[PDB]
Each structure stands twice: as C-alpha cells, then as structure tokens.
Design a protein around this ligand. Structure first.
Ligand SMILES: Nc1ncnc2c1ncn2[C@@H]1O[C@H](CSCC[C@H](N)C(=O)O)[C@@H](O)[C@H]1O
Ligand SMILES: Nc1ncnc2c1ncn2[C@@H]1O[C@H](CSCC[C@H](N)C(=O)O)[C@@H](O)[C@H]1O
Ligand SMILES: Nc1nc2ccc(F)cc2[nH]1
Ligand SMILES: Nc1nc2ccc(F)cc2[nH]1
Lengths: 257, 268
C-alpha cells in the first residue's frame, strides 16, 4: 500500500499505454482487445442507466470511451492525489495532458457509428462530473457524504483490485466493498491482470496478487454477481516488456443479483 | 475558335496559386471539419469509399489528374491500386506532395482525413497504416496539362493506359468555358483504358475561388452539363450525385453552390 506513495503516473502511462502495448494498429494487441470487450458489451444495450462509477481510474480514461455514451453522470475515482490531478489535466484539456486520441479513434473505429474521435472525447469530458478519492479497503470506499450519486446504475474497474490486494482474500473483500456501491440489478465491468505478481511505476514497485480466470469468477459469484461474460487475453511474447510479469488480461461482465 | 488565349490566361493566373492558402481555405475547418456528417468533407470521402466498396473499380494502375497539393481523394483508392501516379500543373504543388511523401512535419496534415476514411471504410484499419500504404503506392508525381492532347507529354513515365482515373476540382477550375472543359475531358480520357473507370469530383455553378493573392476564374457548370460532357467523351454514367453547399460552408473563399461526384466507365 505505502508503495503507492512512490507511484509515478507518467511512468505508469508510459509503461502500459505507449508503444508497444499502446500501439493500437495491430488488432491482435491488448489495447484493441480491451476496447473491443468494452464496446461489444455496451453495444448489447443491456448495460444502461443514468450514473456510473469508475473504480480506481488511475490516470487513464480509455476504460470509459464506449461507456460515456450510455451514462449521463459519470464519476471517476482514485486513491492517489497525483492521479486525480493527472486525470484533470486531460479532463480540462490543460497543458501536458496525456494523449488518449489513439484510443478515442479506435473506440470510434470499433463502435462503428461513424463518430469522430473529437466528439467522443467531448462527450466523455462532459459526462464526467467529478473525480473523487477512494479506498476499496474501506467498507464504504467513497466515504460517508460522497457527492457521488448512490447507488450507481453500473460500475467499471480496470487493473485495480488485484493490484491493491496482497492476496486472494483481500481481493474478495475489496470486491465486496465496491459491490455495495452498485444498485441491485446493476452492472459491473471488470478488467484485470491474470497471474501477475508485480508491476513497476517509476520508483514504485507494486505487489500484485496472482489470480486466475476461475478465481475471478468464483470471487464474483461470492460477491453476489451473475457472471454474464468472462473472457481472457493471453499476453503475446512481444508485449511482455519487463514493466511487470502479467501473463494475461481478463474481462468480466457481471450483474448484481 | 482559338484555345490558346484562354489557356494562357489560365496558366498566367495559376502562377499566383499559393498551395498553403488553398489547403487552409478548403481542407481546414469549417470545410475541413469531418465531425459533421452533413459536411462536404465527409460527403466526398463517403462517395469515394462507397464506390470502391462495390469492388467494381480495380486494377494495377491509377492516375490522379490535377492532384494539386491534396491526397484525401486517394485515401479509399489506394487499397485497390498497386501503382498510383499523382500529377499537377504547378511545381509548388508537386513539392507540397513531396513534403507529405517524405512524411515531413512541415507537410500538411491529412490524418483527420485518413482517420475518417478508415472509419467509414469499416475495416478497423488504423490511419497510420492507410497513410503508409498510400505513400508506398504513389510511384511518381508528374507535371500535367489537361489542355494538351497528351496531358502528360509524349513518352511519359506513367504506365499507360491506366485502369482508372481520379480527378477532383481540376477541369472546371482550369477551363475558361464549357468547350475547353469538354476538350480537357477528352484529353485525359485518352489515358484511360477502355472499360476503365473515372471518378470525377468538382464544383457546381462556381465562377471563382481564392488561393492566396490569386483569385482564379472557374467555368460554372451544372450537373447536366457534366453529364453531357461525360457522354460526349464516351463514358457510361454509372453514378452522378450532387451535394448542395450549406450556407455556413459558404465562406467567401469561392462562390461554389454545390459539389458533384461522378462515377463513369469508358465505353470499350
Ligand atoms: N486502496 C486503493 N483503493 C482504490 N484504488 C487504489 C488503492 N490503492 C491504489 N489504487 C489505485 O489503483 C490503481 C491501479 S492501476 C489502474 C489504472 C487504470 N484503471 C488502468 O486501467 O490503467 C492505481 O491508480 C492506484 O493508485
Ligand atoms: N492546365 C492544367 N492541367 C492540369 N492541372 C492544372 C492545370 N492548371 C492548373 N492545374 C491544377 O488544377 C488544380 C486545381 S485545385 C484541385 C486540387 C486537388 N485535386 C483537390 O482536390 O483540392 C491546381 O492544383 C492546379 O495547379
Ligand atoms: N495495469 C495495466 N495496464 C495494462 C495495459 C496493458 C497490459 F498488457 C497490461 C496492463 N496492466
Ligand atoms: N477546390 C475545392 N476543394 C473543395 C473542397 C470542398 C469544397 F466545398 C469546395 C472545394 N473546392
């Protein structure tokens, strides 16, 4: 946990969202695969509502590109101030913002509605109402009097739980915690690293709990979810770069029941 | 009568043609805004994409007639032709194309066009790949004069006859009158093989446009005049459609009233 106090957003972004992993041209890559799961899921029309919360957003926005057109009130979160600052730089189009435009473009490409990427980013920026601090280790992760409309109609979280959880059991609790934020019948879209034990973010070296696809499913069932979909991306050799030891990436579509 | 005087006026006027001002006037916003699907930019790209998407227009070689300093008109084309010849009257335009081919930063940025083409072609292609293909497939950039009976000169590089021709906003913009327009059409048609296709885009009812200092003269033509010329030159007209310029795209860089797109096949 206290390791997260060294966490460098720019080094994280660079490590995971710039070439090679950030090169979206090849459709067999992890970036396109992620955007596709996201896009395909929302395209079904079954994941809808007014409000949505992104859990442990970090400094990234790609996880909301296909989401923003289905929810008028979007709340983004993160534990670190430095990440919330970095999101704001993109939200307010301030100087030095990270360039997500390749991801926007690809989301537009994938969605196939002939939308221009500027419109997509415009809609996202407009629908994100707030960037709030959060701790999934807390039974009320957002806190007491959070500005966030609760309960949310849906949740999104990518690369968070397994990355803030020393082991399987804490992972499970953290899931139960955020689950309280979700209205019954609501939807959760969860993405994460498979069988990963560490990753770097500049001077920070974060520990990760290695989880498998079945472990992820069981955890979801335990937390009271019906698993609508659960898919795995195996990490090709050329995307194994020495910034971590992730073996695969999972995508889960779960419904609170 | 005499063609030489009019043609000389034209050549003269174009010596003031500034590529940069022209690009700004026509391919930067508002006209270069590709977000509005009702805009002229997306209408053009859509016509070209839909046409190549029939699979009916293909082969080895393609010639773009009067390319100027633009490439958007080849974005959908380049996936169907291994060998592409670009062309223009002005050396300054040919250099402008030079900058883009070398992928120089000084060059004009067509990435919004490349992206929008990838977007409507619906193959999930990324724009960097499309641009890299176009650059690979452009085999030469040649001087051209559509008023000459051999527009490319004699014993020219271009593989002739070409399997298809593209031309956008050239003829009506270098032809002083309908008869000159018709002749220019006849000359370029000699470059197309029989059974080949011409894709033609141009201004409707326009008499002038601006390219910096240069305020140039244009023969205003109508859909029906365009159709008759194509028939006259020995084409079957496969498609001919018209875009009417919205008031807010009428910005005083020209007096264009609409844009036409013609798909025509040379009778053979
Ligand atoms: N106790 C905690 N509660 C919630 N988030 C935490 C947390 N501790 C660390 N985090 C955040 O978890 C994030 C993991 S990295 C994930 C970033 C982004 N979601 C992506 O898909 O790339 C970090 O930004 C980190 O600050
Ligand atoms: N006699 C001639 N023969 C062929 N092209 C000529 C010509 N005289 C001028 N041109 C070219 O006609 C062009 C018209 S502007 C069209 C540029 C481009 N095709 C586009 O779509 O924007 C100029 O580039 C100009 O140099
Ligand atoms: N956190 C995190 N983001 C990623 C993006 C791509 C990838 F292959 C692994 C990743 N881990
Ligand atoms: N030469 C030229 N290019 C154009 C692009 C759009 C338009 F509306 C008019 C144009 N004229």
């Amino acid at each position: 946990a206290s390791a997260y106090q060294r966490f460098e957003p720019r080094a994280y972004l660079r490590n995971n969202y710039a070439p090679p992993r950030g090169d979206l041209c090849n459709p067999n890559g992890v970036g396109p695969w992620k955007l596709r799961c996201l896009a395909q899921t929302f395209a079904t029309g079954e994941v809808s509502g007014r409000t949505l919360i992104d859990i442990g957003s970090g400094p990234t926005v790609y996880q909301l590109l296909s989401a923003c057109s289905h929810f008028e009130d979007i709340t983004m979160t993160d534990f670190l101030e430095v990440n919330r600052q970095e999101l704001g730089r993109w939200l307010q189009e301030e100087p030095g913002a990270f360039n997500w435009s390749m991801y926007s473009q690809h989301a537009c490409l994938i969605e196939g509605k002939g939308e221009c990427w500027q419109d997509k980013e415009r809609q996202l920026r407009a629908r994100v109402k707030r960037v709030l601090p959060i701790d999934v280790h807390q039974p009320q992760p957002l806190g007491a009097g959070s500005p966030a409309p609760l309960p949310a109609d849906a949740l999104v979280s990518a690369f968070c739980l397994e990355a803030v959880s020393p082991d399987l059991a804490s992972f499970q609790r953290a899931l139960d915690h955020i689950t309280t934020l979700l209205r019954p019948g609501g939807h959760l879209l969860l993405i994460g690293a498979l069988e990963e034990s560490w990753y770097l973010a500049g001077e920070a070296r974060l520990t990760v709990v290695p989880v498998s696809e079945e472990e992820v499913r069981e955890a979801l069932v335990r937390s009271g979810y019906k698993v609508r979909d659960l898919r795995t991306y195996i990490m090709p050799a050329h995307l194994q770069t020495g910034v971590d030891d992730v073996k695969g990436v999972f995508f889960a579509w779960a419904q609170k029941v």
